[PDB]
From a paper:
Phosphatases of regenerating liver (PRL or PTP4A) are a family of enigmatic protein phosphatases implicated in cell growth and metabolism. Despite their relevance in metastatic cancer, much remains unknown about the PRL family. They act as pseudophosphatases to regulate the CNNM family of magnesium transporters yet also have enzymatic activity on unknown substrates. CNNM Mg2+ transporters are important actors of ion homeostasis in cells and mutated in genetic diseases associated with Mg2+ uptake and retention. PRLs bind to the cystathionine-β-synthase (CBS)-pair (Bateman) domains of CNNMs.
A truncated PRL construct (residues 10–161) with surface-exposed cysteine mutated to alanine (C104A) was added to the CNNM CBS-pair and the complex purified by size-exclusion chromatography. The complex was crystallized, and a diffraction dataset obtained at 2.5 Å resolution in a P41212 space group. Dimerization is stabilized by hydrophobic contacts between Phe397, Met404, Phe465, Leu500, and Ile504 along with polar interactions such as between Lys428 and Asp249 at the center of the dimer. One iodide ion is stabilized by Lys428 and Tyr426 at the dimerization interface of the CBS-pair domains, whereas the two other iodides bind at the interface between PRL (Arg139, Arg143) and a neighboring CBS-pair from a symmetry mate (Arg372, Lys373). Structural alignments give a RMSD of 1.1 Å for PRLs and 1.9 Å for the CBS-pair domains. In fly protein, both Cys54 and Cys109 are found in the reduced state. Outside of the catalytic site, CNNM Asp458 makes polar contacts with PRL Arg143 as observed in structures of the human proteins. The structure of the PRL–CNNM complex from flies confirms the interaction surfaces are conserved and additionally suggests that phosphorylation of the Drosophila PRL catalytic cysteine will block CNNM binding, as observed with the human proteins.
Residue numbers in the entry:
A (entry chain C): 13 to 165
B (entry chain A): 358 to 512
Write the structure that this text describes.
């Protein structure tokens, strides 16, 4: 289940956890959205070799379920975003937690906030393409997060 | 059928209903577990369910992961006791989800377009249990379900 969020040239594909049963159709959805990197914010539960053969690299940035990402995760998440946009600005970055409803949309929200959107605008933009995509606790920390244009160039 | 009812008029009235009004609830549906083996008893109960598209779940019945088509069973050897997972890993039948408030007219057109197949599963976002919100399947709707709704409603 994909969802393409795009703001100021940056493209995010909020997917769910791919399975070995349907990994082929997951790869085509990535290629259809020009996705080279998949950021996994849940525990690993699928084979990563097949994705690597098709050019899709997988980055593990997991954290506790239903919580807010630690700073080390936020910094690395912004770091990999700045690396991929400079490598190919037309390339989208895929992010997935178990169902693409929690930890993955929160990272996209932080990126949208770092690009100039208020947290309520970022959350609404995500929920416009992904119904029920943030819990109240993760929202309680999105409202306290302070950006500083960490994705300026 | 049903007298060659006007599909245009029938499809218009489908806007007044949603998938939750014609879906088969997950407790009433015939489904297969991913760990099931395709011996003769299993193949027989699939052949006698009358369905051509069998939902396949993993762990919980609500965790639907793929689909089994009767065509996928044509060339299996019931003596081999072939695991259903081995079959599903080969065919990799995709699975598509909609929400309960999805109106039948949009579902009817999406079925006729063939972008998602002819069976759609109905899920909801369960956000009560602490943790990330997760999807929970509650039922399934098919193109045949929409057709008989059109047939049962000729004026």
């Amino acid at each position: 289940m994909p969802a393409l969020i795009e703001y100021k040239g940056m493209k995010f594909l909020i997917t769910d956890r791919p399975s070995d049963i349907t990994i082929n159709h997951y790869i085509m959805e990535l290629k259809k959205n020009n996705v080279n990197t998949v950021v996994r914010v849940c525990e690993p539960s699928y084979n990563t070799d097949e994705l690597e053969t098709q050019g899709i690299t997988v980055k593990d940035l997991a954290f506790e379920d239903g919580t807010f990402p630690p700073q080390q995760v936020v910094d690395e998440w912004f770091e990999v975003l700045k690396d991929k946009y400079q490598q190919n600005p037309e390339a989208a970055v895929a992010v997935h937690c178990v169902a693409g409803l929690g930890r993955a949309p929160v990272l996209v929200a932080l990126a949208l906030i770092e690009l100039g959107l208020k947290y309520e605008a970022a959350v609404e933009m995500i929920r416009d393409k992904r119904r029920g995509a943030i819990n109240a606790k993760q929202l309680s920390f999105l409202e306290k997060y302070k950006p500083k244009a960490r994705l300026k160039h | 059928p049903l007298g060659s009812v006007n599909i245009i008029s029938g499809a218009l009235e489908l806007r007044k209903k949603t998938v939750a009004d014609v879906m088969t609830h997950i407790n009433d549906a015939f489904m297969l577990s991913l760990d099931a083996l395709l011996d003769f008893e299993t193949v027989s109960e699939i052949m006698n369910s009358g369905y051509s598209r069998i939902p396949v779940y993993d762990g919980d019945r609500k965790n639907i992961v793929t689909l089994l088509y009767i065509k996928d069973l044509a060339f299996v050897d019931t003596d081999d006791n072939t695991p259903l997972k081995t079959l599903c890993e080969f065919y990799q039948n995709p699975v598509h989800f909609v929400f309960e408030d999805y109106t039948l007219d949009i579902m009817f057109n999406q079925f006729k377009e063939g972008t998602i197949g002819h069976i759609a599963f109905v899920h909801r976002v369960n956000n009560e249990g602490d943790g990330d919100p997760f999807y929970e399947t509650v039922g399934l709707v098919t193109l045949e379900d929409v057709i008989e709704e059109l047939i049962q409603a000729e004026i």
